[PDB]
Amino acid sequence: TTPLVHVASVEKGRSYEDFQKVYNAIALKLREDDEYDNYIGYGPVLVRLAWHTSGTWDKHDNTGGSYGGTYRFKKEFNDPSNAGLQNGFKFLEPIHKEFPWISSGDLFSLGGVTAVQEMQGPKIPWRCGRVDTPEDTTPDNGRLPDADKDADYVRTFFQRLNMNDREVVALMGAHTLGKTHLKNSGYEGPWTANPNVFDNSFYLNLLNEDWKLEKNDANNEQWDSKSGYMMLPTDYSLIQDPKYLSIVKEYANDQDKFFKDFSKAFEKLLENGITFPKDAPSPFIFKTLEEQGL
Ligand code: HEM
Ligand SMILES: [K+]
Helix, strand or coil: CCCCCEECCCCCCCCHHHHHHHHHHHHHHHHHCCCHHHHCCCHHHHHHHHHHHHCCCECCCCECCCCCCHHHCHHHHCCHHHCCCHHHHHHHHHHHHHCCCCCHHHHHHHHHHHHHHHCCCCCCCECCCCCCCCHHHCCCCCCCCCCCCCHHHHHHHHHCCCCCHHHHHHHHHHHHCCEECHHHHCCCEECCCCCCCCCCHHHHHHHHCCEEEEECCCCCEEEEECCCCEECHHHHHHHHCHHHHHHHHHHHCCHHHHHHHHHHHHHHHHHCCEECCCCCCCCECCCCHHHHCC
């Protein structure tokens, strides 16, 4: 079928103030529900939700992507690749109830932006305008990446999302957040010692830890360190490939550079497939609760 064009349409009469309010609601709940996942909080799962709802995009026909907010439909909601994301969706339920006017796509993506910023990460400019699309526009399962692959697979996989080497290495740095859960993906363990703090620890660990290729309780191979950290085969491929390695070293040695590059790649990821009219509002940069004294 001919590729569709998805034009961003601002929720009727809404402006920066309105979205900052939604951001605040999300941030406030992130602070309140701090016991989730052994006190890691919902930050990490919200970031993964934003990425998986956007990561289904295919640059070839513009199917998938964050625009439609199709994760709300069972086919995508039940994608094996999305196991565990139901927690993020349930967290956003009360937020959507309070602000019913925001589209699902805008909420899913904004949830990721809010989480990164509240966890001390870089500011991520965000644009509104995603519009809910019918259940038949839901992309089939299988568009998200496997974790038992190598550098070549990763590089090729991300080309479908129009991401180059630097963009891929920066985006993978999101693994500085949260952990793998055996019951969700067949992998177990955190990548870092501070799962709810967005920093460049992912890269430093990859380079400085002594990794051992072991098999977890699900009979899958993953790299483990005596410090209690782990890396998926796809994470470890970043130091096996010489081109990826150079970039990992760059980020491990420049926190600001990683922040700037992640911010750009993450916004790009969340905006793939969306056409923003020339007269659309400029991207919003939300203040954190801390900056607002809230
Ligand atoms: C080759 C690409 C990638 C693969 C194979 C991959 C794989 C995985 C796996 C297996 C998990 C564990 C899920 C669980 O058991 O709960 C996970 C978690 C996560 N991923 Fe990735 N991922 C990739 C890229 C990314 C990117 C690009 C982002 C975002 C920019 C990201 C953000 C996250 C976050 C924040 C978590 C933690 C979720 C939580 O703690 O609940 N991932 N990923
Ligand atoms: K971290």
